[PDB]
Design a protein around this ligand. Sequence first.
Ligand code: CA
Ligand code: CA
Lengths: 58, 237
Amino acid sequence: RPDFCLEPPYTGPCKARIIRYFYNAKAGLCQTFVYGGCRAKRNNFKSAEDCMRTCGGA
Amino acid sequence: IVGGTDATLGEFPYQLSFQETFIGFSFHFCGASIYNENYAITAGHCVYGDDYENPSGLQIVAGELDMSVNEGSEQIITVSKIILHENFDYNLLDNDISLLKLSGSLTFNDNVAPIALPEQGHTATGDVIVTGWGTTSEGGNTPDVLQKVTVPLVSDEDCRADYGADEILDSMICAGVPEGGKDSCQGDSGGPLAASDTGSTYLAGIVSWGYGCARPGYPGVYTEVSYHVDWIKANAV
Ligand SMILES: [Ca+2]
Ligand SMILES: [Ca+2]
């Protein structure tokens, strides 16, 4: 999987409450988190499926 | 909203909840303000990346207060078109504003009504009221009941002393107390900052961003509506 999949989730400075997915490498799972609406990092997906397809397997 | 108190029905009739719709439920992700019977005002980053001409699964709710109960005042209308500011800059958060055209007309009453705009170029002063269903602490939970908080406006230069000169644009306005504890937070974006320095209530700001929420020395940053008055009137057609 890409190394960016190993980065912690990043809400950013904006103040929306948008539910996005990130790959949690420690748990080995795609998980939900709150995205604020701007300055997304790469470990930030609109669906669990997008997250699994991108960060799923090594 | 951090450090705020419960609102009451009819207190902020211009407040909207901007929601994503699913089968069996909906999810509030931003606020918005009533401009007229067919148009709402929200932040640009609340809609960035959507299908602007044919948006699906989006609605506004007016006359809302407590999301845990049906109070009979609620009007739920889907969004039919999104007008994102043509010069919206996603990285700088410049021109962070959009309009939502509704697929039907709101009916105005004591609980649902538009908020007046300021005159173009007008500078807001003094205490302002920010409202919404955002989180009540940084990275926390959201309240069922609409929250309100009163905070003093902060000048650009003071706000720039906090964040940096190039990080606060002229068309942004800041608000909060120096000790922190009172702010807008995640889920409040797109919602109203209301001023009253002209003897009447008007929409001075749109909840946009900040360094965390309610932190000492880091007031919330807002899109300054007075810079976009002409834009709103031109596009809300
Ligand atoms: Ca309700
Ligand atoms: Ca300003």
